Curated annotation (Swiss-Prot):
Its main location: cytoplasm. The keyword Hydrolase applies. InterPro entries: Glyco_hydro_13_cat_dom, Glyco_hydro_b, Glycoside_hydrolase_SF, O16G_dom_2. This is Glucan 1,6-alpha-glucosidase. It is an enzyme of class 3 (hydrolase). Its EC number is 3.2.1.70. It catalyses: Hydrolysis of (1->6)-alpha-D-glucosidic linkages in (1->6)-alpha-D-glucans and derived oligosaccharides. CDD domains: AmyAc_SI_OligoGlu_DGase. Pfam families: Alpha-amylase. It comes from the Bacteria.
C-alpha cells in the first residue's frame, strides 16, 4: 500500500459555533480557533475537520449554505479563514473543509435565481417535480416542498430551506468542482463530504443512498479537483458496507481516502426503531462483531477505515456508551484506547479528549437543533409526553454535542465573555475543562496525546492486521500482528469487574489506564481497565 501523510494523522473535528468565542456574542468564531491552535498542536493532531463556516442562514447551522465561497459573518471573514489556514500550517496542522454539496440553502444565489427565473439554467440545479412521491424528509414530513409561484415541488431530504441539488445535471456538478478547486487553491488539506453517498439519488425510483451513478460522480469529482493533489477526503456514508467502502477508499478506484460508516452507531438504538428510541447499555459483543468485520474486510491495499466515536450529529460517547460518574476518566481513556489502536484514521470530536458529556436539557426552549424540534413537534402529537421527548433528546439530540467547549473554570468555561452562550455551558465545566486536563498528568487528554503520538511514530498501527480474541461479553480484546510483532489490546467495556483468562509473555507496555501487570497476574479486569502490551 502506498503511504500518504494522513496514514499517520489523527483528525480533530471543530464545531465552529461552539469552539471559542472572541467577541462576546456567545458564538464561536474563526479567531478563537486560530487562538487555540497551540493547544491543538500540543494534542498532536495533524488535521482539523472544520464544520461549515460558509455563508448560511444557520437553519441547519452551516449545513444550509448560501455561498460556498464566503465566510458567514458570525464566524468572521475570509481574512480570518486565511489566517486560520496559515497559522495551522505553521503549527503542522492541515484544514479539512466540510463539503456540503447534496443541497444548498434556499437563500443560495442558485435557488433564488431558480425561483425568480424558472427558465434560467440554475432552475435545473435543483430537483423539481409535478407529481411527488411518498419520500420523506430526514427532519420529518414530506421530502417535497410545494412552491406556490412556479406550482412545482422541489426536493429536500433535509429541511425545507435545504433544497437538494440536481446531480444529474453535469453543469451543476461542474460548478461544484469549480468551487472545490477554489478551496483547494487556498491550501486546504482535504474535504469531509456531507452525506456524499446520496448524490447518486434517483427520487423517482425511490433511490436515495448508493445510487447507480454515485461512484461515477465521485470519480469525476476526483478527476476534476482533489485527485491530482495529495489530500485527505473522507465521505459521510450512512449506507456504507465494507464492500462499498472498498469501492470508496481503494486508491485504484480514484475516489476517496476513506469513509465514515455508522454500523456501530446503529447500536445506539433498537433495530429499525427511530434513533430517539435509544439503547441503554452498549451491546459489546455486537460492537465486537461490527468492528472486527470492518477491520478484517477492509484489508490493506484494499480500503481504509475511519475511526470515530462521536461527532456534531451524535451523543458524546461517554453519555451513550461510557461512564459519566465514578469511572468517567477511566472509561474515556478505555474507549480512546479501544478505538485508536485499530487500523484506520481516528477522529477526535472537540471536548472528547477531556471527557465532555451530554447536556441535561430541561425543556424544548433550550434546544436549537431543527431535527430535535421537528421530532418533538411530531412526537408530542403521537402519544409521547414532553418529558419523554426531552429524555430521548437528552440522550440522542444533536445539541448535546454542540454545547460550548470547556476551556477553564472561569465565566462560560472560558468560551466567551457574553452573559449567555448560544447553547448553555454544561455545569460540569468546573470539573471538566481543558486547563484542569492539561494540569492533570494522568488526564484523558494525555491518553489521547499518547495514542496520537503512537500512531505518528509507529508503522505497526498502519501495517499490522487485526484479530479478535475470544473473551467475556463485555471484554473487548484483540491482536495487531505484523511480522513477528504481536500487540495485545485489552479493554474492559463495563462498570463491572470482568475475567481475563489469557496467558501471555508481556514484553512491554505501550499504554495503560491501570495496573496491567496486576490484571494479567490475577486474571481479572477492574472496571474500564484498558491497556496495550507488546507480547511474545
Ligand atoms: Ca463570536
Ligand atoms: Ca400557484
Ligand atoms: Ca461580559
Ligand atoms: Ca501535571
Amino acid at each position: 500500500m502506498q503511504k500518504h501523510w494522513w496514514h499517520k494523522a489523527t483528525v480533530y473535528q471543530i464545531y465552529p459555533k461552539s469552539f471559542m468565542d472572541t467577541n462576546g456574542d456567545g458564538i464561536g468564531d474563526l479567531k478563537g480557533i486560530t487562538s487555540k491552535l497551540d493547544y491543538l498542536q500540543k494534542l498532536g493532531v495533524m488535521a482539523i475537520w472544520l464544520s461549515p463556516v460558509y455563508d448560511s442562514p444557520m437553519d441547519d447551522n452551516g449545513y444550509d449554505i448560501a455561498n460556498y465561497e464566503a465566510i458567514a459573518d458570525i464566524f468572521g471573514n475570509m481574512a480570518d479563514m486565511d489566517n486560520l489556514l496559515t497559522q495551522a500550517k505553521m503549527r503542522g496542522i492541515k484544514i479539512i473543509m466540510d463539503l456540503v454539496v447534496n443541497h444548498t440553502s434556499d437563500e443560495h444565489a442558485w435557488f433564488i435565481e431558480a425561483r425568480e427565473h424558472p427558465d434560467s439554467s440554475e432552475r435545473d440545479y435543483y430537483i423539481w417535480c409535478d407529481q411527488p412521491n411518498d419520500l420523506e424528509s430526514i427532519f420529518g414530513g414530506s421530502a417535497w416542498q410545494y412552491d406556490d409561484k412556479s406550482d412545482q415541488y422541489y426536493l429536500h431530504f433535509f429541511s425545507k430551506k435545504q433544497p437538494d441539488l440536481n446531480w444529474e445535471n453535469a453543469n451543476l456538478r461542474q460548478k461544484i468542482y469549480d468551487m472545490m478547486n477554489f478551496w483547494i487553491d487556498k491550501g486546504i488539506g482535504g474535504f469531509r463530504m456531507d452525506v456524499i453517498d446520496m448524490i447518486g439519488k434517483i427520487p423517482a425510483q425511490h433511490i436515495v443512498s448508493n445510487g447507480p451513478k454515485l461512484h461515477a460522480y465521485l470519480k469525476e469529482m476526483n478527476a476534476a479537483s482533489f485527485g491530482q493533489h495529495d489530500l485527505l477526503t473522507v465521505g459521510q456514508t450512512w449506507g456504507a458496507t465494507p464492500e462499498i467502502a472498498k469501492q470508496y477508499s481503494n486508491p485504484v478506484n480514484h475516489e476517496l481516502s476513506m469513509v465514515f460508516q455508522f454500523e456501530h452507531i446503529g447500536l445506539q438504538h433498537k433495530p429499525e426503531a427511530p434513533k430517539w428510541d435509544y439503547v441503554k447499555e452498549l451491546n459489546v459483543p455486537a460492537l465486537k462483531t461490527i468492528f472486527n468485520k470492518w477491520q478484517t474486510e477492509l484489508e490493506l491495499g484494499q480500503g481504509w477505515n475511519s475511526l470515530f466515536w462521536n461527532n456534531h450529529d451524535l451523543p458524546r460517547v461517554l453519555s451513550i456508551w461510557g461512564n459519566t460518574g465514578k469511572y468517567r476518566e477511566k472509561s474515556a481513556k478505555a474507549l480512546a484506547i479501544l478505538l485508536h489502536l485499530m487500523r484506520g484514521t481516528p477522529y477526535i470530536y472537540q471536548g472528547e479528549e477531556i471527557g465532555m458529556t451530554n447536556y441535561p436539557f430541561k425543556d424544548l426552549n433550550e434546544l436549537d437543533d431543527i431535527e430535535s424540534l421537528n421530532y418533538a413537534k411530531e412526537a408530542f402529537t403521537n402519544g409521547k409526553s414532553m418529558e419523554t421527548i426531552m429524555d430521548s433528546i437528552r440522550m440522542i439530540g444533536r445539541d448535546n454535542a454542540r454545547t460550548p467547549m470547556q476551556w477553564d473554570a472561569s465565566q462560560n468555561a472560558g468560551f466567551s465573555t457574553a452573559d449567555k452562550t448560544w447553547l448553555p455551558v454544561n455545569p460540569n465545566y468546573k470539573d471538566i475543562n481543558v486547563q484542569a486536563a492539561l494540569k492533570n498528568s494522568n488526564s484523558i487528554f494525555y491518553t489521547y496525546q499518547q495514542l496520537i503520538q503512537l500512531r505518528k511514530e509507529n508503522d505497526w498501527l498502519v501495517d499490522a492486521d487485526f484479530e479478535l480474541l475470544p473473551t467475556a461479553d463485555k471484554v473487548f480484546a484483540y491482536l495487531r500482528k505484523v511480522r513477528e510483532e504481536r500487540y495485545l489490546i485489552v479493554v474492559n467495556v463495563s462498570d463491572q469487574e470482568e475475567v481475563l483468562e489469557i496467558d501471555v509473555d508481556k514484553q512491554e507496555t505501550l499504554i495503560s489506564n491501570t495496573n496491567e501487570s496486576a490484571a494479567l497476574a490475577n486474571h481479572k479486569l477492574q472496571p474500564w481497565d484498558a491497556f496495550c502490551i507488546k507480547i511474545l
